[PDB]
């Protein structure tokens, strides 16, 4: 990194998606309606999943066809459950502890697998004591 970005650490997030058809919901234009879920975990320096306590809030910014498309969750693993008929790209806003910053994590909600996981690297500052202490749980700081 350069400049102010030197004072950061990288962490890997894993976005975990699951989906299945709901037969009791009438297909929309012959397309089945599916229940789907997204959860977010943190990986440590060994690759083990641990609670993503470095975020005090996650907002899923859903496709505009959803009612109340901006859904806020405050407790790991920030699980969202919805229903729909089509996949879409979405930004997941994760808010670091101590107002350290919003990160927009690009996700794609799709039906290509019953469940699938995607890892994303984010850069996190080291100037908020409580966040730094929390970061120690998932690796070097």
């Amino acid at each position: 990194p350069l400049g102010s970005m030197v004072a950061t650490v990288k962490r890997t997030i894993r976005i975990k998606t699951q989906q299945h058809i709901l037969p009791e919901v009438p297909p929309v234009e012959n397309f089945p309606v599916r229940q789907w879920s997204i959860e977010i975990v943190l990986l440590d320096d060994e690759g083990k999943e641990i609670p993503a306590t470095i975020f005090d809030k996650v907002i899923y910014h859903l496709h505009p066809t959803f009612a109340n498309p901006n859904r806020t969750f405050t407790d790991p693993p920030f699980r969202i459950e919805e229903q729909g008929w089509g996949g879409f790209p979405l930004d997941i806003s994760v808010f670091l502890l101590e107002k350290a910053g919003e990160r927009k994590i690009p996700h794609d909600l799709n039906f290509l697998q019953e469940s699938y996981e995607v890892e994303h690297v984010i850069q996190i500052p080291l100037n908020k004591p409580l966040l730094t202490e929390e970061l120690a749980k998932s690796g070097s700081t």
Binding site: F31, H63, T65, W85, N110, F111, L112
Partner: peptide, 5 residues
């Protein structure tokens, strides 16, 4: 499985 919005 390839359905998109």
């Amino acid at each position: 499985q390839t359905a998109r919005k």
